[PDB]
């Protein structure tokens, strides 16, 4: 059911980095990774938590639909794309933290915890501030647990409405062409060591789906582009994409 392919470590050592890539072949129900131990090591989810947060906000009515505008609060932050109006799509696209902090505040501690247990999401611990626990609180999730969660989302099997899950899968849309479709979400954890970058999602093919989850040490923001690059080099190597 699982197999270790240490040849993939070259794609990390190539960039003087360390990390894990996990792949799941849905048709064959088989998983692959370069590091079985780190595949099961749990980190802060950071902005990958915007997936479950979106689901809960939509299913509870905090977010009515993907067109609803959440206006900038006027406070200039260091990321330009954050200093503007957003909807669910663009807030996901640009990982707009302050938007999702407002979602969390309206969701509330009680309902947030209840839902993460229903999702079987990571360690299901929201200890900390309700509006930042996924950045510096107690919540933890591993690469293999991300994929477990994503597979439930793909099959509309999470304990929320089908509508909520379809909308979030739309918001996750990252890349599409004649060969494949990628729905995914990035993450960047900096407040607690080790600093890491995330990329979790799946690749849709004509007749199969490849789920993926990766994280890697990220001492500086300069290497954030390696999250997608390393993943795509593994996919290319495995002939999942040209
Ligand atoms: C809360 S924090 O993440 O520790 N600091 C803010 C911060 C610092 C550097 C980069 C980002 C950023 C913004 C948009 C998109 C992405 C992405 O990886 O797709 C990353 C955010
Ligand atoms: Cl779509």
């Amino acid at each position: 059911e699982w197999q270790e392919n240490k040849s993939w470590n070259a794609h990390f050592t190539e960039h003087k980095s360390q990390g894990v890539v996990v792949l799941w072949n849905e048709n064959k129900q088989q998983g692959f990774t370069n590091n079985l131990k780190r595949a099961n090591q749990a980190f802060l989810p950071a902005s990958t938590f915007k997936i479950p947060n979106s689901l809960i906000a939509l299913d509870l009515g905090v977010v009515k639909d993907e067109h609803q505008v959440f206006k900038w609060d006027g406070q200039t932050r260091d990321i330009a794309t954050w200093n503007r109006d957003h909807n669910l799509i663009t807030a996901m696209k640009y990982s707009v933290v302050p938007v999702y902090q407002e979602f969390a505040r309206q969701i509330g501690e009680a309902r947030m915890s209840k839902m993460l247990h229903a999702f079987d999401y990571g360690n299901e611990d929201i200890s900390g501030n309700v509006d930042s626990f996924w950045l510096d609180g107690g919540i933890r999730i591993s690469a293999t647990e991300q994929i477990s969660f994503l597979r439930k989302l793909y099959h509309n099997k999470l304990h929320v409405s089908e509508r909520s899950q379809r909308i979030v899968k739309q918001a996750m849309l990252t890349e599409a062409n004649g060969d494949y479709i990628i729905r995914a979400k990035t993450g960047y954890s900096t407040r607690i060591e080790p600093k890491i970058g995330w990329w979790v999602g799946w690749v849709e093919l004509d007749d199969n789906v490849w789920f993926f989850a990766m994280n890697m040490d990220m001492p500086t923001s300069d290497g954030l582009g390696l999250r997608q690059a390393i993943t795509k080099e593994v996919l290319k190597q495995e002939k999942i994409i040209p």
Side-chain angles (χ1 to χ4, degrees):
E1 174 175 299
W2 288 95
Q3 293 189 305
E4 190 168 74
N5 187 333
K6 287 186 177 184
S7 80
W8 297 354
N9 281 331
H11 298 303
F12 289 98
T13 60
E14 177 184 2
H15 303 94
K16 299 179 178 168
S17 315
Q18 296 171 15
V20 62
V21 163
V22 183
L23 302 185
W24 183 262
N25 183 322
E26 185 64 8
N27 280 345
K28 289 187 178 176
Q29 295 287 288
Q30 289 189 289
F32 308 82
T33 182
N34 63 302
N35 187 333
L36 275 164
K37 184 176 68 176
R38 185 167 176 153
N40 286 293
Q41 275 173 329
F43 305 87
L44 279 160
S47 297
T48 64
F49 185 77
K50 282 180 176 69
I51 292 174
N53 203 0
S54 298
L55 290 166
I56 298 163
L58 281 160
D59 212 66
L60 295 175
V62 175
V63 177
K64 298 297 180 179
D65 60 38
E66 69 279 17
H67 302 294
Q68 180 175 4
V69 180
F70 307 102
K71 233 168 178 59
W72 182 37
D73 59 11
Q75 291 191 25
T76 303
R77 300 177 177 80
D78 66 337
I79 297 172
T81 52
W82 290 8
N83 305 318
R84 58 175 290 188
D85 296 348
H86 288 286
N87 59 37
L88 190 70
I89 304 298
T90 64
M92 277 274 284
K93 178 180 180 181
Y94 297 105
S95 301
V96 189
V97 171
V99 171
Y100 279 82
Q101 297 186 290
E102 182 64 26
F103 294 174
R105 292 187 201 98
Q106 291 179 37
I107 292 168
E109 293 181 9
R111 295 191 296 184
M112 183 73 76
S113 173
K114 176 189 74 185
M115 292 291 267
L116 293 188
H117 175 67
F119 291 170
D120 198 32
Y121 188 90
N123 69 349
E124 312 175 9
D125 182 3
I126 68 172
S127 58
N129 299 312
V130 69
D131 65 355
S132 74
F133 66 91
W134 62 95
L135 301 167
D136 56 18
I139 191 76
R140 302 287 190 280
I141 187 167
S142 67
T144 54
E145 291 170 345
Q146 292 261 28
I147 284 174
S148 201
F149 172 74
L150 292 171
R151 292 188 61 242
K152 290 189 263 284
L153 174 62
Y154 174 93
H155 293 289
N156 294 324
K157 288 289 181 173
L158 293 169
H159 290 165
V160 285
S161 71
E162 181 185 320
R163 176 181 176 273
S164 295
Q165 293 174 88
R166 289 190 177 275
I167 293 176
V168 171
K169 287 187 272 187
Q170 174 182 358
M172 287 168 60
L173 177 56
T174 301
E175 187 179 341
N177 53 41
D179 294 322
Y180 60 80
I181 301 169
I182 294 177
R183 306 179 186 276
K185 180 69 197 78
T186 60
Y188 186 22
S189 180
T190 62
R191 297 188 177 187
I192 293 174
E193 295 296 305
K195 301 191 187 72
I196 56 145
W198 280 99
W199 203 35
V200 307
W202 61 75
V203 186
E204 307 179 7
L205 306 178
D206 283 354
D207 51 6
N208 198 7
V209 181
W210 281 88
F211 295 83
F212 67 87
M214 78 89 71
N215 58 70
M216 60 180 289
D217 299 356
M218 194 60 58
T220 61
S221 55
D222 295 332
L224 287 173
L226 293 174
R227 292 171 299 177
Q228 299 92 333
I230 294 171
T231 299
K232 279 174 158 184
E233 287 300 312
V234 170
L235 298 173
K236 286 173 179 295
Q237 172 177 339
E238 301 299 316
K239 298 293 181 65
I240 297 167
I241 64 174

